[PDB]
Design a protein around this ligand. Sequence first.
Ligand SMILES: Nc1ncnc2c1ncn2[C@@H]1O[C@H](COP(=O)(O)OP(=O)(O)OP(=O)(O)O)[C@@H](O)[C@H]1O
Ligand SMILES: [Mg+2]
Lengths: 203, 51, 49
Amino acid sequence: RVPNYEVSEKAFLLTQSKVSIEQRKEAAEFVLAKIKEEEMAPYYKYLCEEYLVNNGQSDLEHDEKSDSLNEWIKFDQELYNELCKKNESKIKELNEKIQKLEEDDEGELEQAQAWINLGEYYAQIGDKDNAEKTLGKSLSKAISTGAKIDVMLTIARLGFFYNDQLYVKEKLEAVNSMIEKGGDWERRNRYKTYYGIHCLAVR
Amino acid sequence: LRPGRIDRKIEFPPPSVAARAEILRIHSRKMNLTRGINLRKVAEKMNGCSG
Amino acid sequence: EIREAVELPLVQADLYEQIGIDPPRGVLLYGPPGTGKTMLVKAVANSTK
Ligand SMILES: Nc1ncnc2c1ncn2[C@@H]1O[C@H](COP(=O)(O)OP(=O)(O)OP(=O)(O)O)[C@@H](O)[C@H]1O
Ligand SMILES: [Mg+2]
């Protein structure tokens, strides 16, 4: 939940070369700490692209420019190794739980809660496509109206991560349908802000 | 209350603490709460004596 | 109890609606008429306008 935007906010500031020298080097520290600890490994490869002509770059597997104005940028091979390991591990654990929920009937509430956890991991690693798929199975099992609304917001959030305004816009049409089915004022405030931020993103 | 005139007699007690929570939960669907409020907690703050 | 009952649906009815309390209805005032029941109605009416 918490690194997903906070890493993106600092990573945007870091990209620019039209910021202050000081502000870019403060940001850069928060970004880098969080890749290693939280396993933001695939979005980190992605972010090496996003400079390109802007400076800072000092990566060991991805392009560098002649002018490195930053050094709180590094690619390490340990990052790649970790990925491979952690990936299989999380996948293996939950899977088996899902099969267990199939054997003895419990699969309405708990298998969707397992697949929510799978999209949060997928989302963590920076995959919008495969987070969304898992968050798709969560729907099919019959759950509360509250849970269904919460899930669509999460998917739309992954749109903000890659800064794709259209990806936000499309998902937030579907929430407009369900919002009055649940009828909550709680998840309507969330809706007001979710939309808030989306409307702020366009002109 | 003479013979054969009344043949089923239904006593109704004051509410249980499980039953008093189930009346509270019906009323909470009209209202908009905040999550983390247990209405089993509320039913135990109360003791009631009627519905 | 009167500022809840009379004054709150005039200033805005929708305050009730959005919390999800449905509004109280009618007010009965009872008592000896020497108690200033009648007096209270005139007091809040001049005030709410
Ligand atoms: N709280 C008070 N402060 C000042 N004067 C008061 C107070 N309560 C009542 N009085 C006075 O006592 C009188 C009677 O009050 P009011 O005019 O409200 O009628 P009431 O009791 O409903 O009578 P009925 O309904 O039988 O006509 C009024 O002159 C009122 O100003
Ligand atoms: Mg009077």
